[PDB]
Design a protein around this motif. Sequence first.
Motif, PDB file in Angstrom:
ATOM      1  N   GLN D  24      19.005  90.603 -27.369  1.00 45.54           N
ATOM      2  CA  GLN D  24      19.075  91.704 -28.320  1.00 45.54           C
ATOM      3  C   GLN D  24      19.049  91.186 -29.747  1.00 45.54           C
ATOM      4  O   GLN D  24      18.330  91.726 -30.595  1.00 45.54           O
ATOM      5  CB  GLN D  24      20.349  92.510 -28.084  1.00 45.54           C
ATOM      6  CG  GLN D  24      20.430  93.818 -28.844  1.00 45.54           C
ATOM      7  CD  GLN D  24      19.187  94.664 -28.690  1.00 45.54           C
ATOM      8  OE1 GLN D  24      18.909  95.185 -27.615  1.00 45.54           O
ATOM      9  NE2 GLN D  24      18.433  94.810 -29.770  1.00 45.54           N
ATOM     10  N   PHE D  47      19.240  86.139  -9.449  1.00 46.03           N
ATOM     11  CA  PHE D  47      20.178  86.912  -8.649  1.00 46.03           C
ATOM     12  C   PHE D  47      19.861  88.402  -8.666  1.00 46.03           C
ATOM     13  O   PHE D  47      20.681  89.211  -8.224  1.00 46.03           O
ATOM     14  CB  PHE D  47      21.597  86.687  -9.167  1.00 46.03           C
ATOM     15  CG  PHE D  47      22.030  85.248  -9.158  1.00 46.03           C
ATOM     16  CD1 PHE D  47      22.462  84.635  -7.997  1.00 46.03           C
ATOM     17  CD2 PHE D  47      21.990  84.507 -10.329  1.00 46.03           C
ATOM     18  CE1 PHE D  47      22.862  83.308  -8.013  1.00 46.03           C
ATOM     19  CE2 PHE D  47      22.384  83.187 -10.351  1.00 46.03           C
ATOM     20  CZ  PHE D  47      22.820  82.585  -9.192  1.00 46.03           C
ATOM     21  N   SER D  88      23.944  77.107 -16.448  1.00 53.88           N
ATOM     22  CA  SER D  88      25.155  76.315 -16.559  1.00 53.88           C
ATOM     23  C   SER D  88      24.818  74.837 -16.466  1.00 53.88           C
ATOM     24  O   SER D  88      23.681  74.443 -16.213  1.00 53.88           O
ATOM     25  CB  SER D  88      26.137  76.653 -15.452  1.00 53.88           C
ATOM     26  OG  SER D  88      25.483  76.612 -14.195  1.00 53.88           O
ATOM     27  N   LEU D  89      25.851  74.011 -16.600  1.00 49.69           N
ATOM     28  CA  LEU D  89      25.696  72.572 -16.460  1.00 49.69           C
ATOM     29  C   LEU D  89      25.345  72.153 -15.038  1.00 49.69           C
ATOM     30  O   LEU D  89      24.892  71.024 -14.837  1.00 49.69           O
ATOM     31  CB  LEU D  89      26.967  71.851 -16.935  1.00 49.69           C
ATOM     32  CG  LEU D  89      28.306  71.939 -16.189  1.00 49.69           C
ATOM     33  CD1 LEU D  89      29.218  70.787 -16.549  1.00 49.69           C
ATOM     34  CD2 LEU D  89      29.039  73.212 -16.542  1.00 49.69           C
ATOM     35  N   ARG D  90      25.541  73.025 -14.051  1.00 44.16           N
ATOM     36  CA  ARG D  90      25.215  72.658 -12.680  1.00 44.16           C
ATOM     37  C   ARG D  90      23.819  73.072 -12.237  1.00 44.16           C
ATOM     38  O   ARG D  90      23.323  72.524 -11.247  1.00 44.16           O
ATOM     39  CB  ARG D  90      26.234  73.250 -11.714  1.00 44.16           C
ATOM     40  CG  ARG D  90      27.485  72.435 -11.583  1.00 44.16           C
ATOM     41  CD  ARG D  90      28.676  73.312 -11.385  1.00 44.16           C
ATOM     42  NE  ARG D  90      29.166  73.810 -12.656  1.00 44.16           N
ATOM     43  CZ  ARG D  90      29.157  75.093 -12.969  1.00 44.16           C
ATOM     44  NH1 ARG D  90      28.626  75.959 -12.123  1.00 44.16           N
ATOM     45  NH2 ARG D  90      29.617  75.499 -14.141  1.00 44.16           N
ATOM     46  N   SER D  91      23.165  74.013 -12.923  1.00 45.97           N
ATOM     47  CA  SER D  91      21.869  74.450 -12.422  1.00 45.97           C
ATOM     48  C   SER D  91      20.754  74.272 -13.443  1.00 45.97           C
ATOM     49  O   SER D  91      19.581  74.455 -13.098  1.00 45.97           O
ATOM     50  CB  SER D  91      21.919  75.914 -12.001  1.00 45.97           C
ATOM     51  OG  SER D  91      22.585  76.677 -12.991  1.00 45.97           O
ATOM     52  N   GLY D 114      27.184  70.512 -21.541  1.00 41.16           N
ATOM     53  CA  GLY D 114      27.691  69.589 -20.544  1.00 41.16           C
ATOM     54  C   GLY D 114      26.779  69.227 -19.391  1.00 41.16           C
ATOM     55  O   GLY D 114      27.269  68.895 -18.313  1.00 41.16           O
ATOM     56  N   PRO D 116      25.124  66.551 -17.525  1.00 45.18           N
ATOM     57  CA  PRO D 116      25.668  65.191 -17.516  1.00 45.18           C
ATOM     58  C   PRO D 116      24.654  64.157 -17.957  1.00 45.18           C
ATOM     59  O   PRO D 116      23.443  64.330 -17.803  1.00 45.18           O
ATOM     60  CB  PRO D 116      26.071  64.980 -16.054  1.00 45.18           C
ATOM     61  CG  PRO D 116      26.101  66.348 -15.446  1.00 45.18           C
ATOM     62  CD  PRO D 116      25.071  67.132 -16.174  1.00 45.18           C
ATOM     63  N   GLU D 117      25.179  63.071 -18.528  1.00 45.70           N
ATOM     64  CA  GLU D 117      24.349  62.217 -19.359  1.00 45.70           C
ATOM     65  C   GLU D 117      23.333  61.421 -18.564  1.00 45.70           C
ATOM     66  O   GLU D 117      22.251  61.158 -19.085  1.00 45.70           O
ATOM     67  CB  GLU D 117      25.223  61.310 -20.220  1.00 45.70           C
ATOM     68  CG  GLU D 117      26.373  62.074 -20.855  1.00 45.70           C
ATOM     69  CD  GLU D 117      26.994  61.357 -22.041  1.00 45.70           C
ATOM     70  OE1 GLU D 117      26.773  60.138 -22.199  1.00 45.70           O
ATOM     71  OE2 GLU D 117      27.698  62.025 -22.829  1.00 45.70           O
ATOM     72  N   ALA D 118      23.615  61.104 -17.306  1.00 46.14           N
ATOM     73  CA  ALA D 118      22.575  60.521 -16.465  1.00 46.14           C
ATOM     74  C   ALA D 118      21.500  61.550 -16.143  1.00 46.14           C
ATOM     75  O   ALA D 118      20.298  61.255 -16.226  1.00 46.14           O
ATOM     76  CB  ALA D 118      23.192  59.961 -15.184  1.00 46.14           C
ATOM     77  N   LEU D 119      21.928  62.768 -15.806  1.00 44.73           N
ATOM     78  CA  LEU D 119      20.999  63.864 -15.550  1.00 44.73           C
ATOM     79  C   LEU D 119      20.187  64.206 -16.792  1.00 44.73           C
ATOM     80  O   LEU D 119      18.970  64.402 -16.702  1.00 44.73           O
ATOM     81  CB  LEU D 119      21.772  65.077 -15.027  1.00 44.73           C
ATOM     82  CG  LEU D 119      22.271  64.978 -13.581  1.00 44.73           C
ATOM     83  CD1 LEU D 119      23.658  64.432 -13.444  1.00 44.73           C
ATOM     84  CD2 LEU D 119      22.260  66.358 -12.979  1.00 44.73           C
ATOM     85  N   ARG D 121      19.531  62.093 -19.203  1.00 44.72           N
ATOM     86  CA  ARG D 121      18.621  60.979 -19.454  1.00 44.72           C
ATOM     87  C   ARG D 121      17.391  61.082 -18.572  1.00 44.72           C
ATOM     88  O   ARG D 121      16.284  60.730 -18.995  1.00 44.72           O
ATOM     89  CB  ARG D 121      19.315  59.639 -19.230  1.00 44.72           C
ATOM     90  CG  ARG D 121      20.142  59.160 -20.400  1.00 44.72           C
ATOM     91  CD  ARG D 121      20.621  57.742 -20.176  1.00 44.72           C
ATOM     92  NE  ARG D 121      20.992  57.460 -18.793  1.00 44.72           N
ATOM     93  CZ  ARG D 121      21.585  56.337 -18.394  1.00 44.72           C
ATOM     94  NH1 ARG D 121      21.880  55.388 -19.275  1.00 44.72           N
ATOM     95  NH2 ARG D 121      21.882  56.160 -17.115  1.00 44.72           N
ATOM     96  N   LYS D 122      17.571  61.572 -17.346  1.00 43.24           N
ATOM     97  CA  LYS D 122      16.423  61.891 -16.506  1.00 43.24           C
ATOM     98  C   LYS D 122      15.582  63.010 -17.114  1.00 43.24           C
ATOM     99  O   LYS D 122      14.347  62.974 -17.039  1.00 43.24           O
ATOM    100  CB  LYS D 122      16.896  62.281 -15.107  1.00 43.24           C
ATOM    101  CG  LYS D 122      17.569  61.152 -14.343  1.00 43.24           C
ATOM    102  CD  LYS D 122      17.964  61.587 -12.939  1.00 43.24           C
ATOM    103  CE  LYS D 122      18.982  60.636 -12.332  1.00 43.24           C
ATOM    104  NZ  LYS D 122      19.692  61.239 -11.172  1.00 43.24           N
TER     105      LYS D 122
END
Lengths: 273, 273, 184, 157, 92
Positions: D24, D47, D88-91, D114, D116-119, D121-122
């Motif tokens: 909006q 969803f 989110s940080l998980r998906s 958040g 994660p920093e390895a993720l 970096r990928k």
Amino acid sequence: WARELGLIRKPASFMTSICDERGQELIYAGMPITEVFKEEMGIGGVLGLLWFQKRLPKYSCQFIEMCLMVTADHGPAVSGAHNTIICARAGKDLVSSLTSGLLTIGDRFGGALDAAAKMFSKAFDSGIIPMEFVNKMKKEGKLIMGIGHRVKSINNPDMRVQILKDYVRQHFPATPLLDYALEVEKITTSKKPNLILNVDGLIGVAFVDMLRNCGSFTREEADEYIDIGALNGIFVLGRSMGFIGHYLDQKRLKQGLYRHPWDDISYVLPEHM
Amino acid sequence: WARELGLIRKPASFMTSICDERGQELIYAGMPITEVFKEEMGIGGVLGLLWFQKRLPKYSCQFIEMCLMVTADHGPAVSGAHNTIICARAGKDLVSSLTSGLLTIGDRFGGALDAAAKMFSKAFDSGIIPMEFVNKMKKEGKLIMGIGHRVKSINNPDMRVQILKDYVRQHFPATPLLDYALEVEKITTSKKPNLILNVDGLIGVAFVDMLRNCGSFTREEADEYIDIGALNGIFVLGRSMGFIGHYLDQKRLKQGLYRHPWDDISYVLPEHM
Amino acid sequence: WARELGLIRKPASFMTSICDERGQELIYAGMPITEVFKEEMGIGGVLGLLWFQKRLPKYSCQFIEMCLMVTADHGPAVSGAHNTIICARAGKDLVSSLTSGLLTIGDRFGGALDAAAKMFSKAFDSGIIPMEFVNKMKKEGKLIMGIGHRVKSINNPDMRVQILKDYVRQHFPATPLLDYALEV
Amino acid sequence: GKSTTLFSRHTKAIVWGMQTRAVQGMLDFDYVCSRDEPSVAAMVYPFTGDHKQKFYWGHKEILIPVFKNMADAMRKHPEVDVLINFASLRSAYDSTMETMNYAQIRTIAIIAEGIPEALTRKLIKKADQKGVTIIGPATVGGIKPGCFKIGNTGGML
Amino acid sequence: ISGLFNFYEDLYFTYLEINPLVVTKDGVYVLDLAAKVDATADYICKVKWGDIEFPPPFGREAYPEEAYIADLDAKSGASLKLTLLNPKGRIW
């Protein structure tokens, strides 16, 4: 007269394993009405006799009456009590208003009782760690039914969730499905702070805890009472109290017809059909 | 956003003096829900809190629960339990089955509660002696609602009229309407032996005794709750427990579609329309 | 007053793409009320306009009217009319009696309209020959919804099948799912 | 190749997630910068099915589709060159890796706090191999006045 | 070192220092370790971490009221800090 003397035959329908009306007393499931009042089982006792046809113990009937005391009205904004206030506000009657308001207890409002019992039972008995059950639901859509509150989140506790919970903590042995569900509470509070187990989810899982963790139920009696849908009825009978309370309140305040003003509607009719 | 900073205005609908859902607790009529479970009123107390929105005392909530316990299922031949079993046996679900059974509580079935309340209260407040009130119901037709039993008579008392009566003879101060109705019972037993105060009449007259003979109701709230129909709902909400018990019974005993065979029906159609 | 001059905003609920009630005429889906009486559509036309919000052609309007004429009372023995008579016989009123009798149009009584459409559409669009479709439903149980009469069988037609069919045989182009169901 | 003109007055987006408040605000920004079209073509929420959300183009109301499949979104809309990811940080790792194999997505703004920093970096290395610009984690967004504005940056109007 | 790199990845490290590795005829022995691990992957590694209290840098002792509303961060959703830079300052 021929059946008074007995000579013809008739096969009978309507098999009714409940409530013998005929004879010298109103017998319930198996108990006379004076034995209802002398053994002093309350309406939890007669819900045990009517709904399950089993004499539930003295902590179970107290939980069922507390349970019907929390599954009462949850305010007039929610969908079914809204339809009750509309139908009562058209001045119908008690019974038609309560009837049209109860005709909303389905799968989106107030049917987290049965869904949050079926799904948690299917997750605990095909057992997964909740830190992977939540991912198994995450891979499929379809959010975990019975989890989430808008304002009271955690250590601003819902306190009808807690008064039930401190009944289930105190007068109440053997809580592995709410120990599992509180472990799901622990783990689904990691994604969101609010996202606590609901009250219409907690009644479902604590009632399955009652059904298959107290006595009197084997596991084929207990699963059939969940598969049939005996957990809808607790929410329905609790919310009928609040619906008729809304009906009497909408008659007492002497309100006339509601109309729902047009600047809340946004007609998006097609061009020329 | 302009309303959040409070600048425009809007008049509201749905006045609703019941069950404040918003805020930190489910507030009922005036009492927090933790006080509800802490002062230990049952569902009779919160029935007082939603229906009349008043703290009815501890004999009275027990009396209301007792009323629900005797206005529970009275067998499956009667019309509402019959509709509940027909809709359960068409295999719908809980809610629509209970709902189609509850939508028959009217004036010919189950409408003896309100009728045997208004009739006895109008005879008591405009006072005629019972030995002429019965004759006033004689010179006009219209039998006295709430008196009569098909089987259980005298020296064979109705035994749930008696449980209720010895509750109201014991736990119930200042009951002039039931005294009046018991004298009407004495005189209506003179014509036929059976003709005792019904359960559907005793809940009516003892509940008008509850309303306008206990406190908390003025006489313009007290007669207003009789005029509205707060006595219809006791029968509705009591008989709904039996309807759910019937529903669960007809699902658990697993019966197929009822059809009502053609030799009870006797088609009397016109000749050639 | 702030909205009549238009300065605040409001998001609305209730999207309702049907039946503009306000203004000078009752406008349906896209059509005014004088037009729908002037174009001479029956209730099949307004069922197309309310239920589907489309101006259906006039053979389909007669077909919808014909179906609504045949799904009337099937005797007072059947479960819904039975509940209507129990509720009316307790002397309620019209609306609650009809409401209780309608409150059983479900899955065991009268719910074969939806089931006999979803099953045949899932079978025809995942198409098998009839001579193996019958066996594929045989290997699962779960009887084909929409098959069976207790009494009127063969050399003894239902005769309300037939008038519907000869309306579909005459006034109705290209009906392949009835062709599939007739081969079944 | 990493582009040098990221946003324009013809930049079209797909915002990932149910963010009616932020989208909006973005369509408010598209109206107040005197743009011709909205900056948002579609939304992607897994969803919920495809429907249309109503929005305000000044006073007039328009409809924006929420699609479920992004391939469906690219078939109906090949003009989108920027994705805003409210996951989110998980998906958002899955969402971003699943985003980058669509060719017309040229820049991505990751809102999340958040990953994660390895993720991430990928994520950085696959952006380097594919040529995508990450504006990623622990950010509020980006604003090019007159052209574009990411999500909730700036705040209200 | 080979398993250690799998240990570097399947536990999601950032920093991992061994200074020195004292290895004798008896075998290998590690004396120092220094580790930074990613907590945002808690959904991967709380099954592997457990009941972890993360020690602070060795600084002064924490106050009880930062502890209470810091507990409230563990109770609710907020982000706090309150740590005094000098407790007898004037600019709070």
